[PDB]
Design a protein around this motif. Structure first.
Motif, PDB file in Angstrom:
ATOM      1  N   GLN C 386      59.804 -32.691 -21.817  1.00  0.00           N
ATOM      2  CA  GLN C 386      59.336 -33.405 -22.996  1.00  0.00           C
ATOM      3  C   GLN C 386      58.335 -34.503 -22.670  1.00  0.00           C
ATOM      4  O   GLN C 386      57.720 -35.045 -23.592  1.00  0.00           O
ATOM      5  CB  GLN C 386      60.519 -34.006 -23.747  1.00  0.00           C
ATOM      6  N   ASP C 387      58.161 -34.843 -21.399  1.00  0.00           N
ATOM      7  CA  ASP C 387      57.252 -35.892 -20.959  1.00  0.00           C
ATOM      8  C   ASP C 387      56.322 -35.360 -19.883  1.00  0.00           C
ATOM      9  O   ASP C 387      56.156 -35.956 -18.821  1.00  0.00           O
ATOM     10  CB  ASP C 387      58.035 -37.091 -20.451  1.00  0.00           C
ATOM     11  N   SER C 388      55.709 -34.206 -20.146  1.00  0.00           N
ATOM     12  CA  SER C 388      54.878 -33.563 -19.135  1.00  0.00           C
ATOM     13  C   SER C 388      53.567 -34.291 -18.917  1.00  0.00           C
ATOM     14  O   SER C 388      53.008 -34.230 -17.817  1.00  0.00           O
ATOM     15  CB  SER C 388      54.570 -32.136 -19.534  1.00  0.00           C
ATOM     16  N   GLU C 389      53.038 -34.938 -19.955  1.00  0.00           N
ATOM     17  CA  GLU C 389      51.829 -35.731 -19.783  1.00  0.00           C
ATOM     18  C   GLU C 389      52.099 -36.957 -18.932  1.00  0.00           C
ATOM     19  O   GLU C 389      51.234 -37.387 -18.168  1.00  0.00           O
ATOM     20  CB  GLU C 389      51.270 -36.152 -21.136  1.00  0.00           C
ATOM     21  N   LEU C 390      53.293 -37.525 -19.039  1.00  0.00           N
ATOM     22  CA  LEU C 390      53.565 -38.769 -18.338  1.00  0.00           C
ATOM     23  C   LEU C 390      54.138 -38.532 -16.951  1.00  0.00           C
ATOM     24  O   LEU C 390      53.723 -39.197 -16.000  1.00  0.00           O
ATOM     25  CB  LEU C 390      54.507 -39.639 -19.169  1.00  0.00           C
ATOM     26  N   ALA C 391      55.090 -37.607 -16.810  1.00  0.00           N
ATOM     27  CA  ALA C 391      55.688 -37.362 -15.502  1.00  0.00           C
ATOM     28  C   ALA C 391      54.719 -36.699 -14.543  1.00  0.00           C
ATOM     29  O   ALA C 391      54.910 -36.797 -13.329  1.00  0.00           O
ATOM     30  CB  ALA C 391      56.942 -36.501 -15.631  1.00  0.00           C
ATOM     31  N   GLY C 392      53.688 -36.029 -15.056  1.00  0.00           N
ATOM     32  CA  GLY C 392      52.626 -35.546 -14.199  1.00  0.00           C
ATOM     33  C   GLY C 392      51.619 -36.600 -13.821  1.00  0.00           C
ATOM     34  O   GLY C 392      50.955 -36.464 -12.791  1.00  0.00           O
ATOM     35  N   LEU C 393      51.495 -37.650 -14.626  1.00  0.00           N
ATOM     36  CA  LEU C 393      50.516 -38.706 -14.417  1.00  0.00           C
ATOM     37  C   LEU C 393      51.087 -39.901 -13.678  1.00  0.00           C
ATOM     38  O   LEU C 393      50.382 -40.524 -12.884  1.00  0.00           O
ATOM     39  CB  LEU C 393      49.958 -39.157 -15.765  1.00  0.00           C
ATOM     40  N   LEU C 394      52.348 -40.238 -13.932  1.00  0.00           N
ATOM     41  CA  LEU C 394      52.957 -41.384 -13.272  1.00  0.00           C
ATOM     42  C   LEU C 394      53.260 -41.078 -11.814  1.00  0.00           C
ATOM     43  O   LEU C 394      53.170 -41.965 -10.959  1.00  0.00           O
ATOM     44  CB  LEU C 394      54.217 -41.803 -14.027  1.00  0.00           C
ATOM     45  N   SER C 395      53.633 -39.840 -11.513  1.00  0.00           N
ATOM     46  CA  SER C 395      53.767 -39.377 -10.139  1.00  0.00           C
ATOM     47  C   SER C 395      52.618 -38.406  -9.895  1.00  0.00           C
ATOM     48  O   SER C 395      52.768 -37.191  -9.988  1.00  0.00           O
ATOM     49  CB  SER C 395      55.108 -38.736  -9.907  1.00  0.00           C
ATOM     50  N   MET C 396      51.460 -38.964  -9.571  1.00  0.00           N
ATOM     51  CA  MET C 396      50.229 -38.206  -9.408  1.00  0.00           C
ATOM     52  C   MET C 396      49.818 -38.256  -7.948  1.00  0.00           C
ATOM     53  O   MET C 396      49.737 -39.340  -7.361  1.00  0.00           O
ATOM     54  CB  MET C 396      49.122 -38.771 -10.302  1.00  0.00           C
ATOM     55  N   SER C 397      49.595 -37.083  -7.361  1.00  0.00           N
ATOM     56  CA  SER C 397      49.098 -37.011  -5.996  1.00  0.00           C
ATOM     57  C   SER C 397      47.684 -37.557  -5.943  1.00  0.00           C
ATOM     58  O   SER C 397      46.857 -37.255  -6.807  1.00  0.00           O
ATOM     59  CB  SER C 397      49.136 -35.574  -5.482  1.00  0.00           C
ATOM     60  N   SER C 398      47.417 -38.374  -4.939  1.00  0.00           N
ATOM     61  CA  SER C 398      46.167 -39.106  -4.812  1.00  0.00           C
ATOM     62  C   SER C 398      45.370 -38.650  -3.598  1.00  0.00           C
ATOM     63  O   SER C 398      44.851 -39.465  -2.840  1.00  0.00           O
ATOM     64  CB  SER C 398      46.441 -40.599  -4.736  1.00  0.00           C
TER      65      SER C 398
END
Ligand SMILES: Nc1nc2c(ncn2[C@@H]2O[C@H](COP(=O)(O)OP(=O)(O)OP(=O)(O)O)[C@@H](O)[C@H]2O)c(=O)[nH]1
Ligand SMILES: O=c1ccn([C@@H]2O[C@H](COP(=O)(O)OP(=O)(O)OP(=O)(O)O)[C@@H](O)[C@H]2O)c(=O)[nH]1
Lengths: 15, 394, 1082, 99, 49, 50, 99
Positions: C386-398
């Motif tokens: 339900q939080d795919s936009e956020l959990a993909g962005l908050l833990s984002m590989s850099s």
RNA sequence: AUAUAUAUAUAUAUAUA
RNA sequence: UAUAUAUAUAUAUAUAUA
């Protein structure tokens, strides 16, 4: 070359 | 395929051993049944699908009420509960029975779980098979820790070399009925020598094949956890009233483990052909008593059964060794008989028995002296020679 | 120490001038001996300032040499010209190696002169030959010539090690001296003006050659190093694969006598079964053609070794065959041009005559596996989908993005490519769409990257945009959870030890069974991966769009479908010359988030089909199908015993049926052993690859010399445990040059043994190999606090970017999306995560590490006076150590060795206490807040933030829990039950099990819960102070092994640790961290 | 013929071999391709026209190859099979399905 | 057992392609037990049914 | 479990005023959340009606 | 363990479910009255408004089944647990009292 | 004036005006 | 006469693998 298996040699005495 | 009418086969002479190498040949029987202990160890099928010991020690700490970590050396209950020593105790219990290679228990007295699970070996494996200087020191350690502090009687005044084992004494000195009915089965558990299909093999009792002997045990040590332990403290009771209840909760799996060992020993017993004999050997193959604890409470719900291309290979190697053994007797008695009858008084028969210990692949010449090699000729000289070799020397 | 003695003879070799002097610097824990250290260091700077010796001073200050420990050695060298070539002609005796030209199929990969291979100056790309290590060739030749003068006068056994490392040096030195030693720049990059007359691949040849001749110990090693040093000057392409070829075949010839095994719940047993090795005659005709391809390549001393082993086929001489395979990967990397690596990879031949009856079953088996992985977290509406936009962005590989963008962060503008820095720009300028993913078609194609393998052809890799990570993070994080609970996918058998994980190969191996290991020639760009792999997954998200009911679990599952529609046709952007070449490539994209979770689906669902078609002829019963991307095996259990014809007719029926799906493969079958990963099960004994290039990196890193000297040693201890013995006197010689630092002109500073081997941030190598040693003596715990005081540095780039109007607009747009409240303990806790996430940028982390080392030079030129009362790990072990009493004890050899390539001082520990039976998990307990926050919100807080929450008010814990998204009745059941008070004693105990490591490079192999280590450790038991009990039985179990490795003998401890010293240590274990523990000492 | 993608998804969801109590082996559905059904039509007529004795072969740990063995015995006459396999298929049906 | 109607219709076919192929048999159809047997897989019979 | 998003803001601005913290009257256990009460109420009713 | 009885040998595939085999082997009255309701809790197939739908038992809609369980969950908490140790008795009597 | 994807284990390091 | 419960902190670098 390894020694042949005992199963494949004894279908060959038959065949 | 169905073979035609003109197919022939060479029948190997499998008749039981004519030297009686278990009778006064104590050093040759040490390495003729070390050889049958290693071969039977490579055939007995290995336990897959055990309960994981992380999920089994961490349930054994919630039950014993020990703050005992996974890495703490808990030498009182939880030492050595591996899984490498779970398949190992399954193998050296089956393959020692198939070769009649007598074990020798090794344990620590202050490890109370190896004495609870040590009560399961003696009620399954017949006690004429553990070595006596290590059976007595294990039957005594159970009595003076678990059974005699149960009924509050005096700890056992046992001296060395007393001709009664400490379970054979403590069934007369005890007054209970459930733990003198189990303790009588341990003193009267023996292999039953029956000659089946030409060979003599030693079957178990029928109450060990059923698993019903565990129902004589978990009825015994259930009553033993109901005693008050009068002379012992409160903590010594609740340490081992909790330890003896770890095994009574596994009554479902131990009545399935006794059926597994006694079935895996049945079908492997069918694939042997040499006359198995129950004679105490010199060198004893050691069984750690910690490994029995790794077997009694790590197995569950997964039947292992030997796939028949390890029965057809364990059988085809016990015909190839037993027919190499018999056709080296007959090649050697035919020279000993044809040397005495030809009157060769100036020839010594050490060399033609030295060939007989050499064509047999397992023995070594640099160990046997010239007195265990001329005493062997004295048995070979009295055998009747084979008919195909007698009609060609006559 | 032994390393200090190698130091003072390396100085007397490289500086053979009467103008040269060495000044030792000393420090001590005593306040009296410190003033003995200050006066001594001052006088050697005044006496050696004006031509006065030091032999009259070392006797007067001999109260400080024999008692204090060495800090550093200063080096004065008034040498204007490097004397490398002046002492190179002494070894340049042999004939120079003339290069060959007809041996390669390309032109740039041939060994030509660089003037003839590159016509002018401007088109000189060093990236084909660049070693990319921070050493030079001029420093390597001084590291061998130092060794070749120390071991000149030797005894009759050690002379033959010296002699075989000399005739292999005359091959190297007489070729380098013909063209002259190349002169590098200050960036360790070989320019064009020096390589004008030198042959190309002379630096990367002589770097890979010097690594070989410092590993030649026996005469079996010399015949390999003689036929690889001469040949790697000629053919850089074919040589690494011709020698490494028959090891995939030779693993199937050895018999099984007694093998290891792992049961179903992953734990180690030992088995005794005897299984013959059954190979047909078409293996010995495929092995003769693998030994004639090694004879046309010139080498003739290697196939004489193999053909002298084929008449044995025994596991006793298989350590020789694993040595030949491992020396093949040391010839250097196969780097080639970016155009020829892609255009030879992106060329494939598709065919419309493929069996379509087999694809509609292969598509369905991918469909029924994707639904099977997400039927549970979609039917129950999970908190992470339900939080795919956020959990993909908050833990984002850099790591990186495709292009270089001119990012502007307030005042300081920077040219960066990092992926989370692109998110901060596009969320500031408003050009960031959450639900729209960009199309990778003929307009806006995919950029490329490369990864270099030491023996394989240079491969390409795909760098997708950042919007293909937010679409694919939440769904694929739910597919890695099912890959850890299934017996087929190889994310399940992934532990620390290697016997446990790759030991399910030998569970079902018997004489009625047939193992089957196949490697597809290329898993990317296969015919069965373009159309039938995408459309099997898109169908799996149609049946999953009907499982749920939310408008938000469908919407994240209509984005993970949209990234598969867009990748069914794709284009790669590769430039050449001045034109850009757009190549159509609709196949799988190695480089997505999906590239391992859907290489375990697409290869299991493929081999579940090719195992179905060979059951028309042979009726069997398969047992396991383990799959790891491309590399998979599948055990087949038959009815009869396996013969030489059932092996041949299955290898002809798996190869041909794979060819019916247009997938070119070689299919190998055996009954004894496979080669699944590079880890090789052979005869019941696991054998490893053991090829790591020490003096050649595949790419230049983001690290300095003080960190690249640690990975030279860390690549050596892995090389030594795996069976490739490099000389420790050469690795130690190569650390004394990498950790060199030039203070001024003509003055170098060399750190001692105590600066490098101590346990701190500035660690390079352990004192004795394979073990960590926490030095409990007072002169060594005192310098650990001197190194733990300067590790906290600030970088000016990361603080100019953290106060910008763009980075604050990214945190405030991420804190508003997460929490529907006001609290600043998360906004100050998210912003500390992205400041920590910006360390992947290169000039940020370089200005962190250079401020570590340039502040170490002020600490090393002077005796240290920094006195601090910090509790370290090395201060806990100073209080335990005087209460140990050692006693010598004998312990027999019971257990069997399973890795024959291990060294003798490690293998004796395994033969006494046993290989590891099960992976010990003693990590205490997670706190009850982190099971309450990570179950509702996708924000994972640090454990120094959850302690800050607990110490707040009762009404401020509840405001924090409701802030994340927890309902009111759940937080008021938490807070009202006062279990925030119990979590003070589970956070503070979570740092105890984090402290000391039972896993290392070497400690993973042993069994720490063995009944033979618990016999020697005799510690009495105290019921309370549980934290102290763990650290006693762990440090005692480590002290016996750290003694039994160094000396080969066993000792038995006894720690009657008193009750008055346990409670003093119980508060030392709770005060390591920088937070308020309720129990302190003083 | 019936398409292979249809019959397998009905046979692997009615049998449900993956969710069984045993997990010592990886169980899936094998040999339901369109090349063996076209090959059992050739063998079962040509070994019946020319009087050549057929022979059975199977693994007895699965029952979907053993339930369909009941159709084989009821159509092909029992004197065709070599007797030590006709026994070892009739005994294999009886000791695990019928009895 | 649910596939009955399409399995009455297979043995009507399996014994018709035998029935009219047997009319083209001029050699005598003697039935004895042969030595080598043509092997039939029951995993190939569960595909035809 | 359920309430609107703004009521969290409407209940945060008066939480420090009206201290009602153990009104829920439950003993906590590890593994207890409200998202599973809302889940088990739906997979008990909807598995009966279908 | 609350009554001190021996834990049951329940083999795989017995036709009697282990509540239907422990209402005969138990000798209490209040925990043998709850085990009779669980053994005979069934849907009641009635046709209502032309649509056959399966209403629950009348005691379950009332709530009275909980007053049959908590009357049985109280007698099981006042037992002694004779075989098991005291902390096992304290681990259930703390958890059976939260309900 | 400056190019290095993704996942899995493992180890080292780090959090503060 | 009585000695509590519970399995996947985060980030970067490094190597092994895919
Ligand atoms: N100057 C310098 N010396 C290095 C470098 N790398 C290693 N060295 C050391 O310097 C020795 C070789 O001499 P050079 O490389 O010419 O260094 P140098 O003596 O200071 O002379 P210059 O380079 O001209 O400053 C080797 O033995 C190394 O110990 C480097 O990059 N620069
Ligand atoms: O860095 C990497 C390496 C590998 N992979 C993924 O692993 C897959 C298998 O990696 P392999 O190295 O087995 O590929 P290959 O079969 O092409 O190798 P060769 O026979 O040519 O030697 C690749 O095809 C790709 O999907 C990555 O995604 N990234």
């Amino acid at each position: 070359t390894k020694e042949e298996h005992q199963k494949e040699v004894q279908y060959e005495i038959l065949q | 395929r169905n073979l035609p009418s003109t197919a022939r086969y060479i029948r190997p002479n499998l008749l039981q051993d004519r030297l009686n190498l278990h009778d006064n040949f104590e050093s040759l029987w040490d390495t003729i049944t070390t050889s049958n202990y290693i071969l039977a160890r490579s055939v007995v099928p290995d336990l897959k699908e055990l309960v994981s010991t992380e999920a089994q020690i961490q349930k054994m700490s919630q039950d014993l009420q020990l703050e005992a970590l996974t890495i703490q050396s808990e030498t009182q209950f939880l030492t050595g509960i591996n899984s490498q020593a779970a398949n190992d105790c399954f193998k050296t219990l089956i393959a020692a029975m198939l070769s009649q290679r007598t074990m020798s228990l090794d344990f620590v007295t202050t490890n109370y779980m190896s004495l609870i699970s040590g009560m399961w070996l003696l009620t399954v494996v017949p006690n004429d098979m553990f070595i006596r200087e290590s059976l007595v020191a294990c039957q005594l350690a159970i009595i003076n820790t678990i059974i005699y502090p149960a009924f509050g009687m005096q700890r056992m005044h046992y001296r060395n070399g007393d001709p009664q084992t400490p379970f054979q004494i403590a069934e007369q000195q005890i007054q209970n009925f459930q733990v003198a009915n189990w303790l009588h089965f341990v003193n009267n558990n023996q292999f039953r020598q029956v000659v089946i299909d030409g060979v003599l093999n030693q079957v178990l009792n029928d109450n060990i094949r059923n698993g019903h002997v565990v129902n004589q045990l978990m009825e015994a040590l259930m009553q033993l956890s109901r005693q008050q332990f009068p002379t012992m403290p409160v903590d010594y009771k609740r340490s081992i009233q909790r330890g003896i209840l770890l095994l009574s909760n596994r009554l479902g799996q131990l009545v399935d483990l006794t059926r597994l060992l006694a079935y895996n020993y049945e079908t492997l017993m069918a694939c042997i052909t040499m006359n198995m004999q129950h004679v105490q050997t010199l060198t004893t193959e050691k069984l750690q008593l910690t490994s029995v604890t790794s077997l009694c409470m790590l197995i569950g719900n997964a039947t292992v059964i030997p796939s028949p291309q390890t029965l057809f290979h364990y059988y085809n190697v016990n015909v190839n060794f037993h027919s190499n053994y018999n056709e080296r007797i007959n090649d050697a008695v035919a020279i000993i008989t044809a040397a005495n009858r030809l009157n060769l008084y100036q020839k010594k028969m050490k060399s033609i028995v030295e060939d007989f210990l050499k064509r047999l692949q397992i023995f070594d010449i640099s160990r046997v002296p010239d007195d265990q090699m001329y005493r062997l000729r004295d048995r070979l000289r009295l055998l009747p020679v084979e008919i195909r070799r007698l009609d060609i020397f006559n | 120490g032994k390393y200090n003695l190698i130091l003072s003879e390396y100085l007397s070799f490289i500086y053979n001038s009467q103008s040269a002097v060495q000044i030792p610097i000393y420090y001590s824990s005593n306040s009296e001996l410190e003033n003995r250290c200050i006066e001594f260091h001052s006088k050697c700077l005044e006496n050696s300032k004006n031509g006065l010796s030091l032999k009259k001073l070392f006797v007067e200050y001999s109260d400080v040499i024999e008692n204090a420990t060495l800090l550093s050695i200063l080096s004065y060298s008034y040498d204007k010209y490097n004397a490398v070539e002046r002492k190179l002609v002494k070894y340049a005796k042999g004939k120079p190696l003339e290069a060959d030209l007809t041996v390669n199929e390309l032109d740039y990969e041939n060994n030509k002169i660089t003037s003839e291979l590159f016509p002018t100056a401007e088109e000189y790309t060093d990236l084909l030959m660049d070693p990319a290590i921070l050493t030079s060739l001029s420093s390597n030749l001084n590291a061998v010539m130092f060794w070749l003068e120390k071991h000149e006068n030797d005894v009759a056994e050690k002379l033959k090690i010296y002699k075989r490392r000399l005739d292999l040096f005359t091959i190297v030195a007489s070729t380098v001296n013909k063209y002259g030693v190349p002169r590098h720049n200050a960036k360790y990059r070989y320019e064009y003006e020096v390589m004008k007359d030198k042959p190309y691949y002379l630096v990367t040849w002589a770097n890979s050659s010097i690594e070989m001749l410092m590993s030649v110990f026996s005469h079996e090693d010399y015949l390999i190093a003689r036929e690889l040093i001469v040949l790697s000057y000629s053919n850089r392409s074919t040589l690494a694969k011709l020698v490494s070829s028959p090891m995939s075949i030779l693993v199937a010839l050895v018999d099984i006598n007694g093998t290891f095994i792992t049961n179903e719940e992953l734990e180690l047993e030992f088995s005794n079964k005897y299984v013959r090795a059954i190979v047909p005659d078409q293996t010995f005709d495929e092995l003769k053609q693998m030994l004639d391809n090694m004879r046309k390549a010139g080498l003739t001393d290697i196939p004489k070794m193999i053909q002298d082993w084929l008449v044995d086929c025994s596991i006793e001489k298989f350590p020789l065959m694993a040595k030949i395979y491992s020396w093949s990967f040391h010839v250097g990397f196969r780097k080639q041009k970016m155009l020829d690596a892609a255009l030879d990879q992106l060329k494939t031949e598709y065919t419309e005559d493929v069996d379509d009856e087999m694809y509609r079953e292969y598509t369905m088996l991918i469909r029924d596996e994707v639904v099977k992985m997400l039927e549970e977290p979609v039917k129950h509406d999970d908190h992470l989908l339900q939080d795919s936009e956020l959990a993909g962005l908050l833990s984002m590989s850099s790591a990186s993005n495709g292009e270089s963008r001119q990012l502007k962060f307030g005042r300081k503008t920077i040219f960066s490519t990092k992926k989370n820095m692109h998110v901060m720009d596009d969320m500031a300028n408003g050009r960031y769409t959450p639900g729209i993913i960009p199309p990778v078609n003929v307009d806006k194609p995919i950029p490329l990257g490369r990864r270099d393998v030491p023996g394989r052809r240079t491969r390409i890799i795909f760098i997708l945009p950042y919007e293909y990570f937010i679409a694919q993070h939440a769904v694929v994080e739910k597919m890695l959870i099912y890959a850890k609970h299934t017996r087929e996918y190889a994310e399940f058998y992934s532990q620390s030890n290697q016997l446990l994980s790759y030991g399910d190969v030998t569970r079902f191996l018997s004489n009625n069974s047939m193992v089957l290991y196949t490697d597809v020639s290329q898993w990317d760009s296969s015919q069965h991966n373009t159309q039938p792999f995408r459309k099997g997954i898109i169908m799996g998200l149609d049946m999953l769009a009907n499982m749920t009911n939310d408008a938000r679990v469908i919407q994240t599952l209509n984005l993970y479908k949209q990234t598969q529609i867009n990748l069914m046709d794709s284009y790669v952007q590769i430039p050449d010359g001045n034109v850009i070449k757009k190549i159509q490539y609709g196949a799988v994209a190695s480089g997505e988030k999906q590239t391992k979770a859907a290489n375990s689906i697409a290869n299991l669902a493929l081999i579940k089909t090719v195992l179905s078609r060979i059951s028309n002829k042979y009726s069997f019963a398969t047992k396991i199908i383990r799959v790891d991307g491309d590399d998979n095996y599948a055990v087949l259990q038959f009815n009869t015993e396996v013969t030489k014809q059932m092996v041949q007719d299955v290898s002809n029926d798996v190869r041909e049926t794979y060819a019916r799906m247009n997938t070119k493969v070689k299919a190998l079958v055996s009954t004894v052993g496979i080669e699944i990963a590079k880890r090789y099960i052979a005869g019941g004994k696991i054998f490893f690859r053991a090829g790591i290039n020490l003096l050649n990196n595949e790419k230049k890193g983001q690290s300095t010399q003080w960190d690249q000297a640690a990975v030279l040693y860390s690549n050596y201890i892995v090389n030594r445990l795996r069976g490739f013995e490099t000389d420790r006197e050469f690795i130690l010689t190569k650390i004394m040059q990498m950790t060199s630092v030039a203070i001024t002109g003509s003055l170098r500073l060399f750190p001692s043994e105590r600066v490098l081997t101590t346990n701190s941030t500035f660690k390079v190598f352990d004192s004795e190999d394979f073990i960590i040693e926490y030095g409990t003596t007072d002169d060594e715990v005192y310098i650990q606090r001197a190194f733990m005081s300067l590790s906290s540095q600030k970088s000016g780039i990361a603080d100019e970017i953290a106060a910008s109007s763009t980075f604050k607009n990214y945190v405030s747009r991420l804190s508003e999306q997460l929490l529907f409240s006001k609290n600043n303990i998360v906004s100050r806790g998210i912003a500390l995560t992205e400041k920590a996430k910006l360390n992947s940028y290169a000039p940020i982390s370089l200005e962190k590490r250079r401020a570590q080392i340039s502040a170490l030079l002020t600490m090393l030129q002077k005796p240290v006076t920094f006195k601090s009362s910090k509790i370290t790990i090395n201060d806990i072990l100073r209080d335990i150590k005087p209460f140990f009493t050692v006693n010598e004890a004998h312990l027999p050899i019971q257990y069997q060795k399973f890795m024959p390539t291990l060294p003798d001082n490690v293998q004796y520990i395994i033969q006494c206490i046993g290989s590891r039976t099960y992976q010990i998990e003693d990590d205490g307990s997670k706190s009850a807040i982190s099971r309450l926050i990570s179950k509702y919100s996708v924000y994972k807080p640090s454990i120094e933030e959850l302690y800050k929450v607990i110490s707040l008010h009762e009404n401020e814990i509840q405001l924090y829990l409701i802030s994340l998204g927890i309902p009111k009745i759940d937080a008021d059941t938490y807070v009202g039950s006062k279990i925030y008070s119990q979590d003070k004693y589970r956070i503070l105990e979570s740092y105890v099990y984090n402290l000391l490591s039972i896993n290392y490079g070497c400690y993973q192999l042993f069994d720490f819960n063995s009944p033979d280590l618990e016999k020697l450790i005799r510690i009495p038991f105290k019921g309370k102070i549980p934290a102290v009990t763990f650290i006693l039985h762990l440090y005692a179990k480590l002290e016996v092994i750290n003694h039994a490795i160094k000396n080969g003998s066993w000792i038995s401890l006894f720690c009657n640790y008193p009750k008055s010293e346990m409670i003093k240590l119980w508060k030392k274990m709770w005060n390591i961290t920088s937070l308020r523990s309720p129990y302190t000492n003083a």
